[PDB]
């Protein structure tokens, strides 16, 4: 592990509080793609020009076309990524990738099979996996590992800032710092929690409290910190119980309350390491109206994450929006600080 003197940032756009994505270029000359930087996974991929146009999701996204890149290097090994919420499939290629002004030779999936659900609902084209190599499919070095190798970054860490969605363009949607954190976007001190184990961005959670009565995760539980998840999530059975405590109605994909009931909802607290992380209802209610005649969705969802990573809660965009997040690969921990 060699360290340098550099920090790089990636400017993110915020689509509807649910997808935070930045721009990368692949190939010579660069082909640009909108991508999510996803700590829940470790593979890079973008849709391929070899994706059959019978996948409509391929009709509606940018396609990487190897035949137009002079730095491409073929490989071709089959690759399937089976996330908890959908799957993609294709084959591995290598090309040069530009991210935050850093150029790195990276092996990545060209995706030729991309389901309309969920992918038709993606504003982004691809994914940049930010997790450990232990979780990379095909044993492919993740992009951050390859950048670390160049010995240019000041610290073996990266940090996420997710903004609250603005209508006004001079609000940046968010920011990733590779090799550091950005003190403009947090205040107070970081508090850290150790990873249970290297290989996964998952920490122990000591309790989940709702208001001043209800207690979940009473004996302890897992918290995956997932920058590529829209929401905070829990196991179906946990969320069943959290939602009971809030007076919420279950639908197929989400929970809702009558919009007028939203601001009366208690705080929700997450006990991580030394500290309680508290969200008020404004942090977890999509308060689109104050009417009793309208439903408001909640940014806390049920999700069963498979083993071995699950069963687990996941702290996604709903959480990061309040808490500036640092991922420390040197010391295998995660730090949180109040975002600003
Ligand atoms: C362990 C949880 C982890 C979660 C996952 O990284 C998601 N956060 C990714 N998101 C899903 C999603 O649904 N997105 C989405 C959001 C809004 C609209 C449309 C879309 Cl497609 C965006 C992305 C970034 C693709 C995972 O399954 N990881 C899987 C990876 C890594 C490792 C653990 C799991 C099984 C593996 O075989 C090994 C592959
Ligand atoms: C793809 O990459 C792996 C990684 O070392 C390699 O062993 C394999 O032979 C490659 N396949 C081809 C056809 O280039």
From Swiss-Prot:
Active site: 38, 226
Notes on activation and inhibition: Interaction with ATP6AP2 results in a 5-fold increased efficiency in angiotensinogen processing.
Superkingdom of origin: Eukaryota
Annotated compartments: Secreted; Membrane
GO molecular function: aspartic-type endopeptidase activity; insulin-like growth factor receptor binding; peptidase activity; signaling receptor binding
EC number: 3.4.23.15
Gene Ontology CC terms: apical part of cell; extracellular region; extracellular space; plasma membrane
Domain Peptidase A1: start-end pairs: 20-337
Enzyme class: hydrolase
UniProt keywords, alphabetically: Aspartyl protease, Cleavage on pair of basic residues, Disease variant, Disulfide bond, Glycoprotein, Hydrolase, Membrane, Protease, Secreted, Signal, Zymogen
Reaction catalysis annotation: Cleavage of Leu-|-Xaa bond in angiotensinogen to generate angiotensin I
Key word Lyase present: no
Disulphide connectivity of cysteines: 51-58, 217-221, 259-296
GO BP: any one term: response to immobilization stress
Sugar-bearing residue positions: 5, 75
Subunit annotation: Interacts with ATP6AP2.
Family listed: Belongs to the peptidase A1 family.
Role, per record: Renin is a highly specific endopeptidase, whose only known function is to generate angiotensin I from angiotensinogen in the plasma, initiating a cascade of reactions that produce an elevation of blood pressure and increased sodium retention by the kidney.
Disease: Renal tubular dysgenesis: Autosomal recessive severe disorder of renal tubular development characterized by persistent fetal anuria and perinatal death, probably due to pulmonary hypoplasia from early-onset oligohydramnios (the Potter phenotype).
Protein name stated in the entry: Renin
């Amino acid at each position: 592990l060699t360290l340098g003197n550099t920090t790089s940032s990636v400017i993110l756009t915020n689509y509807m509080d649910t997808q935070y994505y930045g721009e990368i270029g692949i190939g010579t000359p660069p082909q640009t793609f909108k991508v999510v930087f996803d700590t829940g996974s470790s593979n890079v991929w973008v849709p391929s020009s070899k994706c059959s146009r019978l996948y409509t999701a391929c009709v509606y996204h940018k396609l990487f076309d190897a035949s137009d890149s002079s730095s491409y290097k073929h490989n071709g090994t089959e690759l399937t990524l089976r996330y908890s919420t959908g799957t993609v499939s294709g084959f591995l290629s290598q090309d040069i990738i530009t991210v935050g002004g850093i150029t790195v030779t990276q092996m990545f999936g060209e995706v030729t099979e991309m389901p309309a659900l969920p992918f038709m609902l993606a504003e982004f084209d691809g994914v940049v996996g930010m997790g450990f190599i232990e979780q990379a499919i095909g044993r492919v070095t993740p992009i951050f590992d390859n950048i670390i190798s160049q010995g240019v970054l000041k610290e073996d860490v990266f940090s996420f800032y997710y903004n609250r969605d603005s209508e006004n363009s001079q609000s940046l949607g968010g920011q990733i710092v590779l090799g550091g954190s950005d003190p403009q976007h947090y205040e107070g001190n970081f508090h850290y929690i150790n990873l249970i184990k290297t290989g996964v961005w998952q920490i122990q959670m000591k309790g989940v409290s709702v208001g001043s009565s209800t207690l979940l995760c009473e004996d302890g539980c897992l918290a995956l910190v997932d920058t590529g998840a829209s929401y905070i999530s829990g196991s179906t059975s946990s969320i069943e119980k959290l939602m009971e405590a809030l007076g919420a109605k279950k639908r197929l994909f989400d929970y809702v309350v009558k919009c007028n009931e939203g601001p009366t909802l208690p705080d929700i607290s997450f006990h991580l390491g030394g500290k309680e992380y508290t969200l008020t209802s404004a942090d977890y209610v999509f308060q689109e109206s104050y009417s009793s005649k309208k439903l408001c969705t909640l940014a806390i969802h049920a999700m069963d994450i498979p083993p071995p990573t699950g069963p687990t809660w996941a702290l996604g965009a709903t959480f990061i929006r309040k808490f500036y997040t640092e991922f420390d690969r040197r010391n295998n921990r995660i730090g949180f600080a109040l975002a600003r």
